[PDB]
Structure 1
């Protein structure tokens, strides 16, 4: 009867008429709510990308790093990279479907918000929030475009930085819209929460609204709604929100797994290849392992993904995995030629860096880069202040990131985009334990292995905290139900259940020194797993699982590594370990703890009692 709902006049790239019906309704409905000045339907092209970066550059939002081929630096408002667990929520009808109800009495395993409370929060944030801004429409695929394991999302955002970062971290643009058609998609809505004219001052040219920041997931509506943060997992909605939180629930419903894991292909000196997956928490070295440069001659490691794994059993019973991402969103500090040479090669072109330092010659810098600068070369830190090494504060944010295309990794796996995925033959769990836990062990069965994931603990970055499956920040639903879902894989037709190992790269001696060199040397641990998967009698039984036999690991080229301390298993340590695990599972999982996990707990306690 007027113009009405129709936002066609405001579209500055693409066409509302070209969009699938449901994609149009999502765009237009949110344009009516958020009141953007313009709508830009992203095409994913090189031209779109370069022009948006230059626009951000001209506005002071990013800086060009002149030392490299098409690389960039964003410095954020320091408020927009903090602990946001309290403000990261999942909405379901019943709380218990999202988190187990704890016995006493705050859950560490997720954060639920009622539908009613979320609706009020939403209405207090989104109306008018994009006034004076462009709403970008990002059509994106999580996984290779053709894969039956891939899933499609549409992200609406008012941040150009999100558009640029999503082009790297997902497959995005017109091809995705054409693959989608009338199919289902995850609705992803994001705003930085700073309508124009600005009500509060802009800090460091970085739009955000810390007071109203809220990152919400609505699995039953297939929706992610995020407000107030421009940063990382809060804004690049494909990564944690979709590919872990939403996806873990879809995976529960549909019979597959969405995990905080790397995927790698390892080939031995007789040309035999196996794929492995590994779940470690943030700051425990997934990205180092996924891109490993092995030291043992004749071995080769190739990278499928470094952070998220999606996995489903096929009709042959193979556990097929895809990497749903298109890039690596990797921790910058600590990355060097010695810790990750393949990453260093990857990130020297077409890469966006966030919150790292800049050298006077237009290069990047961070703690642990291990590269001397020429005399006269100076460094600008991440807070835009001159910085000297003798100063107390750090130069780059400790969780600062690179965002790089996966196709540029020199050891990217030839099957990293294969639509059927790669067959997983082993699953590795691990974290930072300074004491008690040996370098590597093998779980005794599937059920024991699920227990091993459930029992994971790690030093916080002193305090040791539970982080089951490295998924504590990411469960899309009740953790006890997640354990039951893992256990149910053993009831599948023809399932070839992978060997579950637990590793510890981080054990230390009584003065604080690491007992194992790690990095490329971890190839020696992977050799042992490869053979154990092959059925080699290289294993000795212990109470916690199988460990390598004396002389089973190749230790040539390493000095006198203290194997007695590194593989030591102490009754007193493991007695304490089991009681703590018992109390945690009772409190935090309570009535939803599967019978099989309580049984594995009882069995471990018993094996320890007989030492």
Structure 2
């Protein structure tokens, strides 16, 4: 195809693969992306010409755009996401599995001719800092320009990644199509997609095949498909960890930095914590990431984290100058693509929770929206901003260092109205794994439906594991067993969402979570107490710095209470979950569960 002839690499495996894909999908032309600022502008000008992008008032925003999607293509589709390992047991009970030969036959049928009437982009990229010994590289082939521009922000895309591949370097093969072939002469739509959607991962060959969605983690294949699904399977095989964790640098009033990694499920506070503004005099906070952490042991035996991503793909609604000024400042520097937010009368963007009460807006469907009248949200409730990390004012200077940052503490947490204390320190590594493995959160989904349950979401990875959950637990246990336990991060479990009898929050959270992290630091520095309980070490209210905090000590005590009775009721929920994990549940997790049972009596 034209002009693969004119392509800036001698990597023959790449060229072949591009040719084989093009022969199948039959695009009008193939274009290799270089990631320059020039190309970005051209792509964006095209997308504006197509009507997919609206340019935002340049007086208010530097080089920014609003994109609106088809309302059928508005989120990740977990019921259409598949781990297609050779054996169903290697996908495991948390994944949808399909026999790989079966899946290939479905997807090859779907891909045949699917790019008719479009450009096929070949997008090389790097996950992690460019300057690594063996960086993790990929190529995404896509027929969406939206995808290319988003990939440019969310990954290290283009010329530099293509050069790192050399002539025979390995890379992850990622194929994407929106699945909306055009007939000759046919007018295209602003957001092409298909009613048939598949997001498929082949862990053994390290390939991702996506079809039919233009949106988010369905289409930006670095963001979840590579960074967690494929990466988790590589990490399992190569001796490291790919996780759903923010990375936070906390700096004490003396001049000491502590790095923490925290795994909360979506909607449980990762973005807030990752951009924490501490409330205790002299403490500062910087971010390395609010989503993905890749972690590996160094020569000295410590665990080092790196963010593989290069941008933030944040949920917009709720974001404002009070809730997250640092997120706001990042967006204010421009170079941002908003997806599915509302457009103001002066060509700015708005969404629910932002300052102002615009009386009229154009909503994310392109319809007129009116204050105290229009029954639908102006911004889609899961709309996004896509912005460069380098614009974040509290970004840590080590954010682009390939050797990463040494982790002191790993935090697990989710939303629990009852039972789980504000903070608890694990007893050892194995116990740590167990706390992670049984993380519970009170949240449910539209097509889960019912309602008040406690979802189990092991390390915050329920939708993202690239292999059997039991073998993942084992992998965590093994990394601990084979390490020097003095160099290992300590493990904590937090809960910001415990409620009193009248149902208010016992803990105020947000900035004040800096006080919980201070206890954690103090435990690392042998400066704070905590009582041994059935579920781990938990501070008394006296062990915590509440100086300056306008809250009832009775509330804090209640937020910290470990009640044997509540915990006994938790045990059959946990038991059901561990039975679900099935035959690959490790003995180590069952042993911890037996220990927990013994201590609760």
The bucket for the TM-score relative to the shorter chain is over 0.9
Query: Which residue in 2 is equivalent to 1:487?
Result: 477
Please report how far the alpha carbon of residue 593 of structure 1 lies from its aligned counterpart in structure 2 after TM superposition: 0.9
Residue of structure 2 aligned with 1:470, choices 460, 472, 479: 460
For the 8 Å contact 2:116–2:182, the answer to whether it is kept is yes
Please report how far the alpha carbon of residue 552 of structure 1 lies from its aligned counterpart in structure 2 after TM superposition: 1.8
How far apart are the structure 1 equivalents of 2:184 and 2:463? 32
Where do residues 271-350 of structure 1 align in structure 2 (5 Å cutoff)? 271-348=255-332, 349-350=334-335
Q: What does the per-residue CA deviation read over 1:95-150, in whole Å, with 9 as the maximum and x for residues that have no partner?
A: 10111xxxxxxx3x111110121022112200111111001110100000112363
Alignment of 1:189 onto 2:175: yes
Query: Which residue in 2 is equivalent to 1:72?
Result: 65
User: Bigger shift: 311-320 or 488-497?
Assistant: 488-497
Where do residues 359-508 of structure 1 align in structure 2 (5 Å cutoff)? 359-369=344-354, 371-373=355-357, 378-390=360-372, 391-461=374-444, 462-463=451-452, 464-494=454-484, 496-508=487-499
Q: What does the per-residue CA deviation read over 1:42-77, in whole Å, with 9 as the maximum and x for residues that have no partner?
A: 010001001111111121111112131111111111
Unaligned runs of 5+ in 2: 445-450
Query: Which residue in 2 is equivalent to 1:32?
Result: 23
Q: What does the per-residue CA deviation read over 1:502-561, in whole Å, with 9 as the maximum and x for residues that have no partner?
A: 111111223332222211111111111111122224222111111123322122332233
What count of residue pairs does the alignment treat as equivalent?
586
User: Bigger shift: 557-566 or 252-261?
Assistant: 557-566
Q: What does the per-residue CA deviation read over 1:131-171, in whole Å, with 9 as the maximum and x for residues that have no partner?
A: 11001110100000112363000000000000000000000
Q: What does the per-residue CA deviation read over 1:463-482, in whole Å, with 9 as the maximum and x for residues that have no partner?
A: 32111110000010011000
Alignment of 1:511 onto 2:493: no
Alignment of 1:221 onto 2:205: yes
Query: Which residue in 1 is equivalent to 2:522?
Result: 531
User: Bigger shift: 271-280 or 355-364?
Assistant: 355-364
Query: Which residue in 1 is equivalent to 2:82?
Result: 89
Q: What does the per-residue CA deviation read over 1:20-56, in whole Å, with 9 as the maximum and x for residues that have no partner?
A: 1111111111111111101110010001001111111
Please report how far the alpha carbon of residue 200 of structure 1 lies from its aligned counterpart in structure 2 after TM superposition: 11
How far apart are the structure 1 equivalents of 2:520 and 2:306? 21
Q: Residues 434 and 150 of structure 1: is their aligned pair in 2 closer, same or farther, counting only changes over 3 Å?
A: farther
For the 8 Å contact 1:143–1:322, the answer to whether it is kept is yes
Q: Residues 198 and 401 of structure 1: is their aligned pair in 2 closer, same or farther, counting only changes over 3 Å?
A: farther
Please report how far the alpha carbon of residue 15 of structure 1 lies from its aligned counterpart in structure 2 after TM superposition: 2.7
Alignment of 1:242 onto 2:226: yes
For the 8 Å contact 2:197–2:212, the answer to whether it is kept is yes
Query: Which residue in 2 is equivalent to 1:208?
Result: 193
Query: Which residue in 1 is equivalent to 2:159?
Result: 174
How far apart are the structure 2 equivalents of 1:81 and 1:198? 28
For the 8 Å contact 2:76–2:218, the answer to whether it is kept is no
Residue of structure 1 aligned with 2:105, choices 100, 120, 134: 120
How far apart are the structure 2 equivalents of 1:501 and 1:418? 26
Please report how far the alpha carbon of residue 17 of structure 1 lies from its aligned counterpart in structure 2 after TM superposition: 6.2
How far apart are the structure 2 equivalents of 1:299 and 1:49? 39
For the 8 Å contact 1:149–1:310, the answer to whether it is kept is no
Please report how far the alpha carbon of residue 333 of structure 1 lies from its aligned counterpart in structure 2 after TM superposition: 1.1
For the 8 Å contact 1:505–1:518, the answer to whether it is kept is yes
Alignment of 1:356 onto 2:359: no
Q: TM-score, normalised by structure 2?
A: 0.95
Stretches (4+) displaced over 4 A: 198-203
How far apart are the structure 2 equivalents of 1:201 and 1:135? 18
Query: Which residue in 2 is equivalent to 1:591?
Result: 583
Q: TM-score, normalised by structure 1?
A: 0.93
How far apart are the structure 2 equivalents of 1:240 and 1:148? 23
Query: Which residue in 2 is equivalent to 1:103?
Result: none
Unaligned runs of 5+ in 1: 1-6, 100-106
SS of equivalent residue, structure 1 residue 292: coil
Residue of structure 2 aligned with 1:551, choices 538, 542, 564: 542
For the 8 Å contact 2:541–2:557, the answer to whether it is kept is no
Q: Residues 150 and 503 of structure 1: is their aligned pair in 2 closer, same or farther, counting only changes over 3 Å?
A: farther
Q: What does the per-residue CA deviation read over 1:262-312, in whole Å, with 9 as the maximum and x for residues that have no partner?
A: 111111001111111000011111111111111111111111111000001
For the 8 Å contact 2:540–2:557, the answer to whether it is kept is no
Query: Which residue in 2 is equivalent to 1:607?
Result: 599
For the 8 Å contact 2:259–2:406, the answer to whether it is kept is yes
For the 8 Å contact 1:244–1:474, the answer to whether it is kept is yes
Q: What does the per-residue CA deviation read over 1:358-410, in whole Å, with 9 as the maximum and x for residues that have no partner?
A: 111222211222x1247xx6322212212234233222122111111010000
How far apart are the structure 2 equivalents of 1:198 and 1:514? 60
